[PDB]
Design a protein around this nucleic acid. Sequence first.
DNA 1: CCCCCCCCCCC
Length: 171
Amino acid sequence: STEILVDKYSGLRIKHLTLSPLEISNRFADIRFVRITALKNSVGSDRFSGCWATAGVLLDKGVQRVSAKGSSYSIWKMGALDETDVSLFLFGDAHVHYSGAAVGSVFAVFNGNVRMDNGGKGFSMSVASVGQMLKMGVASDFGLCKGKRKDGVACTMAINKSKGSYCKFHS
DNA sequence: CCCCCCCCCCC
Ligand SMILES: [Zn+2]
């Protein structure tokens, strides 16, 4: 049957759990957790100094990229399915080992290096190591917009199916 | 060699 966790950490609802609730508290035990939506308002307040972690839904896997050094990497759109997103850069092993992940997945991110751009591009974080990514499961509220683009292509914006079936762009 | 690696959709 359906098995849904209503997580206090991420503030998300997760199905297809890859771990027990006890295992969650263990991973987050000695770590300062910051909600993925609080991130942009948390820059420059010593929130990311020590060991920290966040968690969000994979909204967009973007396109294949190549580093200046010639290595491949990823740029993910992550969020809590609430009109607010954030950029995640997957480098090296992290990209190798998680670039095939499915949109809708719920990932815990550990100790990402933070970049904040007050020029409009906003909050972003990056990780490069395998243990910096933990798939907790699948967002039970995740869905794709049922609306269509201007050119007739099905919209691929992530939505909260519990609160509606369309983007900010479709109403 | 390792670490490093860094953004123009959907209105
Ligand atoms: Zn749409």
